[PDB]
Amino acid sequence: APESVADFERLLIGNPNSSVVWMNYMAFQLQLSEIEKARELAERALKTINFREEAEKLNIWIAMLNLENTFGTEETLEEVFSRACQYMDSYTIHTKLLGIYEISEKFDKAAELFKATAKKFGGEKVSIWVSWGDFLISHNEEQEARTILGNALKALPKRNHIEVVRKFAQLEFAKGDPERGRSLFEGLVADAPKRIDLWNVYVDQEVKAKDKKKVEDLFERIITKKITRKQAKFFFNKWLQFEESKTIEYVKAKATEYVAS
Amino acid sequence: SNIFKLQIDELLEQVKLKQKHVLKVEKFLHKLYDILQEIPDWEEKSLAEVDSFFKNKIVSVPFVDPKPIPQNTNYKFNYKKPDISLIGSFALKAGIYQPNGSSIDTLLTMPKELFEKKDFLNFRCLHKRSVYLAYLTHHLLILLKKDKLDSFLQLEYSYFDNDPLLPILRISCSKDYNFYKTRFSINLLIGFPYKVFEPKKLLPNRNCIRILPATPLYNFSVLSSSTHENYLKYLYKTKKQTESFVEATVLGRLWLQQRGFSSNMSHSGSLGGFGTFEFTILMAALLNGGGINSNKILLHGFSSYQLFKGVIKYLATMDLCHDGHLQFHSNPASKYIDEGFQTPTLFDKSTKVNILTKMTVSSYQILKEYAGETLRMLNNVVQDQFSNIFLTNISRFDNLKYDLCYDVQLPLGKYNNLETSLAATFGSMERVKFITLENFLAHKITNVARYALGDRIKYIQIEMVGQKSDFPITKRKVYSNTGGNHFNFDFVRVKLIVNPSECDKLVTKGPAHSETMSTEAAVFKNFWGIKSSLRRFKDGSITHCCVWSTSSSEPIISSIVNFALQKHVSKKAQISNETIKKFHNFLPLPNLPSSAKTSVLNLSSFFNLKKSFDDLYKIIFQMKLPLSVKSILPVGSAFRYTSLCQPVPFAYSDPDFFQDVILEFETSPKWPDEITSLEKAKTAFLLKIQEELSANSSTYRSFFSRDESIPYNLEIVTLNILTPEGYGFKFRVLTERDEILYLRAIANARNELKPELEATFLKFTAKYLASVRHTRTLENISHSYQFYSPVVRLFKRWLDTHLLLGHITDELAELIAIKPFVDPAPYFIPGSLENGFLKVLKFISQWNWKDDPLILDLVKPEERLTLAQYKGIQMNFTNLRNSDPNGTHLQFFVASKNDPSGILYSSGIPLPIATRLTALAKVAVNLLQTHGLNQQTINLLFTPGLKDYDFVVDLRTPIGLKSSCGILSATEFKNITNDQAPSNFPENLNDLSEKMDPTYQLVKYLNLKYKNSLILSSRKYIGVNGGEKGDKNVITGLIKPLFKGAHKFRVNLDCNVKPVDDENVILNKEAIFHEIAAFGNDMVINFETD
Amino acid sequence: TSDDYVLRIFAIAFTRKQANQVKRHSYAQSSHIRAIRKVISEILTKEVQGSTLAQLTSKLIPEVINKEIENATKDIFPLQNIHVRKVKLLKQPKFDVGALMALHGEGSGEEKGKKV
């Protein structure tokens, strides 16, 4: 078993790319509680890894943000944050810093830096809206997670409006208010009911949110809406299997009626 | 002097057990001298009855040569109770732990009533001493056998200081009471009383033994046996003077036993002569005397290092042998006098014996030179070498200490078979000047060697290998038949360190010619004889001299010592050497006119290449360009004299054929901005100069060549000039915009390609900028370090046979080889190919990586790096590899004045190759230290050493490349390669590939393709090691320790795959060897696994 | 130099009357003189210290540090013909017989017939 730093050095020399045991040896230095020496071994890993391996570099950034979140001072946290954003992909290391924040359970400064990151780059990326809206609806800030939609429809254009309010509706169907999510989605229903994947994930979200009469109304209005020869049997292979897993022969009649007229 | 005192105390702390292990052996000698106190005595006896009294027993009696015939017996023997003296070294308690053990001085002094007023002649006092030791040791073994402790302890006869005038008793042990765990012997000696006589019959300038020649060893031995107690009184009064004497003598003891200067003798044909006790005696005399005004030289107030450097300075720059020596009196100034006794000498005026007379002029010469260089390497302050001054056994491997060695295998036979066996004198006149056959033989060998070579050798030493001082009790001598003779040497080893400047001068100018034939002319005539002549030289003077047909497979000093021993010592003494002849022609023999007959220090191939380069230089200057040439200068390997083969004309196939010359144009501002356009403009200028060259000088030719060593710009183009003299040159244009273009790229590039682009800039400034300064400094240094060019040629050959030149570059090899040439700290500046090559090998076996930065200051003997720059290099090293853990990629660190970065020539090679080099050096040095130096040892060292690791792929180009590579293969028919070396550049120029070999470019492209998963080494100089026909090459190589077992596949595992498991794939060896074979169907023939 | 020779190497320079000039003077402002002398001492110090003595002769013969001075110094002033005019050696390293023979070509004095 690796319990000696000479053996850990032997393992890292036998393979230098593997950030799993790189971070494990740095966490071994954390087990002996050396944060500055762990940062020395950290920058050693930075200078020694082949830089083409971006995924193991990403795991090294997991290690950096873990160190400066749990042990170091926050001025050194923003220092290693600044060198991270000048080294590698800023948006991804932003959202995984936010992920490490929500694991470490800090919220007060986290909402203000949510606002800061939305001011920086939130106008064209969506995972920030995902994390911010989910954090607010889980930590009981429904009014703030509803007035985030003003800035969402402000910054995002028409190309991304449908997706941002769709994922808003998904979050408020799962851990929010389904009437609020339906009020968001019926505007897109009136905008383009021809769109099929949004309708299918909408009836799926209503299935998983368990509203019996509303999923009945959706599955009996879908065929009345615009439906082609693939979409009919597609939504019937959704619908009969959802109701299987009387009101079955009532749609078995229409499933063979609509192939004739 | 802040860390050196701590180093002195730690050197002491290497051995500080002088209390625990001293008590048991001193109680052993307490019981011993109690037994000697109770030994019962004896009265006067006769030789003609004590002979039978020792005949009937098993113990016999030793003798100085010869045994006394009763015709001269008029001495009266005795066997008395001796006053026993436990004196000397461990009385002073100056302990050192040795594998052969120290010895307490203990003397049975002689009582006053068994000597007389004439104890200085005809060795009957020494015969008394022999018979007295015989009966006292028989009495002591009888008393040991009655006391019953024989099973662990035993006693042996031995000579004191390897000298037959004084046999002594070696008390030792073997495997409750058994002693085995400290110094393994004490020595019982027998001596004469103090007040005997006066210096006129006590000097080495008298004689009374029958034919007045000098009796030096005689009246040294008996006088040191009689009068050596004022030494001990003076030693203890200096002990009361200052306390630094015991640390001083253990310092000198470690110094002289790492120099190999034990207390035997140099007269006997052995290294040594000088002794540690003589070092103590001379130091104690130097604490009061030594000055010209008889001054206090060493004050008795300071510490040990200052008096140690004082005595080293005094026996370094002040002479004791030739011009001056120090007279002295223990019982009142001590006076340096300017006349010499033509012997290593210091005089006593209260004892009147000459304490250095155990050594000769040759051993004093080598000791004075060692003292001079150790004073030089202790005075310097820029770098400390305490670990190079006191922690190096240069005597463990003897051929490392000396430049070259020869053997004298002579079956002379018997003491009475002297005349027809050896051509030197015989009689009591020489047997009173000397002692024995080997003694006057060794002195004759020194005299004929120094007069045979003159100032063609730095220093001469001579030893008798097969000597055995451990002769048993029942035998009257070492009565050993040592392979053809009844004397105590198996053979006679002569070692030289040579002056490398005129080491191979093919004539030896003796004395000038006149009508009156002078005495030195008569000496030269009688010394050389049949090969002497008198010649006129070109200036007009007439000198007696001797011509020497020089050769490449030998130095001429071999033939000179052969003739000058087979004319003087014996006409059957066979000289055997084969190491020099074995790896003196491992250098490839260049196919030149008479190059087998020429020497190895000849550089005429390089000078002919530079003459052709000067022709091309004038032609490329006096043409006209739109931006003319500012400075054209070569940088190539032939221009720094370190090409492997000597460049013969028209040799295409050597990869060191196309030397690179660079040219810099004027500093014009109109160069373009980016690197592809400025390199394209460099191609435009090269196209212009080759166009005008084919326009005006049709006898030359030109062809372009893409380059790829500077990466990420495929458009770097050189031209290559094929000259009518027979050589080719590769022209590279340098511009002032280049390094600032690369720094522009470094500055504006992205923040994760920074070390990659820094590696590109490293390769650029290794090939263009600093390599100019590198070739200037080493080309300047290769005229004061003469053997540097053959040792680099031999090292490149050896590293090519051991398969490293594909990864490793030339500059590492050159700085490795210049390290022992510029840093002689344990040794000398090497003046032979053998000594230089194994100096390099010993160093790179000694070489650490974590705590040995290789700092060089490339300078001639007697500028350097300053102290601040040395601290800067050390700081660069320590921050460089404390940020670096253990060299995952930065294995070697080699700094000079030309490059303070250090990583300039070592960056790029892999850790398997570097570890293979260091482990192979370790293998070579332990192989040489145990298996012994031999021709079969050298050839087994220069085996390829495949050491089969995962593949060997065997190549075959369709032409044995010796003819187009320009090396004769020791073929006895010179004509069959004289008509075969294609001494004409071909008409079509697209045939150069198929008369060349592509194996280096193939293994380079393969290594950069599979750089992550398996490394590939090869041979590149195919003619020098590809068989006698010169047609073979291999592609060997290690697989990474990651890719030993199977590994799960991802999108970036970077390997050829064999998916047999759906997740964990392995590299398909059959596929990678088969694409290798598809790449080399015309090239590879064989594949071997395992 | 890169060897142990030391040179008091000199350099002379002259003001060019610029083309399309009118004034008779063409004088340097004597604070351009310090700039020209600083850059000329710097660049010929570089041209010595990056060279050996044989290389210094082979780059002084085809008169190229003059054109290098003119190219690196035409920015500040027009500078009519530049020359070096003096190289004085002040200390020589050693002999090095082998290096001196390497500067010409090798040679080995050998036999002539005795006939007596």
Next chain:
Amino acid sequence: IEDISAMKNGFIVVPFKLPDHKALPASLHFMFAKRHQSSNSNESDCLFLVNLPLLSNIEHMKKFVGQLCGKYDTVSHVEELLYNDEFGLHEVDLSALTSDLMSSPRNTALLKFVDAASINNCWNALKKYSNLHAKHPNELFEWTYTTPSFTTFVNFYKPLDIDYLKEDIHTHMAIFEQREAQAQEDVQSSIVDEDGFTLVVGKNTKSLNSIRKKILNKNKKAKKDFYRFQVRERKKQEINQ
């Protein structure tokens, strides 16, 4: 085994044959495969292949897909292999690194096609090809060998043809001096800003990119006396200590 036909994460195994060797009798040169895309037009309908053979260029791909269209009679027209950097020679671009002209994966080969139904046909054909390669190694689709490796990269070692690199330096200098001169005059007369301003350029500077990256790279004398309150502080310090 050879009977495996599809990897863990969607990769399709496509092995190959080996020629006649003077020391081996084999016939496997493994390779992975994947359909993918990105936003740009250079990487439309494209295919990953990991573990490319040594120098399997565009012509080798033409011969391979010609044998494939002989076997399964699909639709296949190959054009280029983006990221053909299997040596390690063209990772960084020095010209785009420090220049104005031509401004701005691992060991793979990304190969694009002429149609999405063409890459669909080739992908499903490739899945069936992997299955037949798994079942039997004798009835197998195979790619032949006319070896541009032999035409180009064994004989490096060659004089470069003078007319070729002469017309190359002519054309490259002809377009380079033109774009350099137009960039120089463009920065020398760039007077108008949209709000009134005049850009200071400096004399004989050649590029707006040059002054831009220069200004990115380029990123008092109080008295201790003479004021009443400061000399009060000084005399207060002298009074205290």
